[PDB]
Design a binder for this molecule. Structure first.
Ligand code: MG
Ligand code: MG
Lengths: 166, 172
């Protein structure tokens, strides 16, 4: 028994993703090597669709599904990242537990470079020290939904970030 | 192969169209009162699903499947199934293009066996001329000839998937 309040409106997200877009563009425009943005599903699908449209560099788009448990590849990438600039695209960084492991896994395949871009970082919640090179918003430890993030399989389609209120 | 890309469906025409697909989808499903889920086929549907789902004013789950993309007489194989159940639910399959219909047809049969309440396909692009197998398609963004198209999720040799418009590829 809850309500959703707006936490970050749709206009702010868009403004912020244009700025991330310019930045990812300046970091990578002079590489000349193949680039791929790598979404973590299901949560990253919306951020990736918006971010990849703001990245003014030829790139592949690929996806990955990762799980007191091991991080397991439930769906690996469709393409090779060896010798490629790879940017991992994630809805939210929290503990850092999963993203740190996903980072290690892709690192074995020897990309030219490897980096993370997350829309939301909850740095009060961090349990592991994970290098994150691009952040949308550092946020308080709120119960967030919308923009791909769910509450018991709800609100992934909301075009703003909401916080859930019990 | 040496080439250029021209704009064919600008970004703003895709948006206008997606907004109308969402009113249509809302209309058909608002009074259902069952769980609804939008099932995108990866990788093609990712960006269309992003925009479409935001224009659907009904509470829905969003889920994805990867079916065998072997390309354009082998079996359609689930590389990655749904994470959530569809029995008793309204399911809208979301695709970027229907051409031959082989994959979409086999994806419909598989999900059908799960006994959703209803099953329906929304594609952004339809090439009716390329149909090899009849499949019903309730919601279509644009009907186009067999042009060589890219962008908005459609790759040419794992390139142009991030273009915010549909382009035509011109072989030089
Ligand atoms: Mg994490
Ligand atoms: Mg097909």
């Amino acid at each position: 028994k809850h309500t959703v309040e707006v936490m970050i409106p749709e206009a702010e997200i868009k403004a912020r993703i244009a700025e991330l877009g310019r930045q990812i563009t300046e970091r990578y425009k002079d590489s000349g090597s193949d680039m791929v943005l790598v979404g973590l599903l299901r949560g990253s699908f919306m951020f990736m669709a918006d971010l990849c449209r703001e990245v003014q560099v030829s790139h592949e788009v690929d996806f990955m599904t990762a799980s007191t448990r091991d991080v397991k590849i439930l769906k690996d990438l469709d393409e090779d990242i060896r010798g490629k600039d790879v940017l991992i695209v994630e809805d939210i960084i929290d503990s850092g537990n999963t993203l740190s492991k996903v980072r290690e896994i892709l690192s074995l395949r020897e990309p030219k470079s490897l980096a993370i871009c997350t829309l939301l970082d909850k740095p009060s919640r961090r349990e592991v020290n994970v290098p994150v090179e691009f952040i949308g918003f550092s946020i308080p430890d709120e119960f967030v939904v919308g923009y791909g993030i769910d509450y018991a399989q709800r609100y992934r389609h909301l075009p703003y970030i909401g916080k859930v209120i019990l």
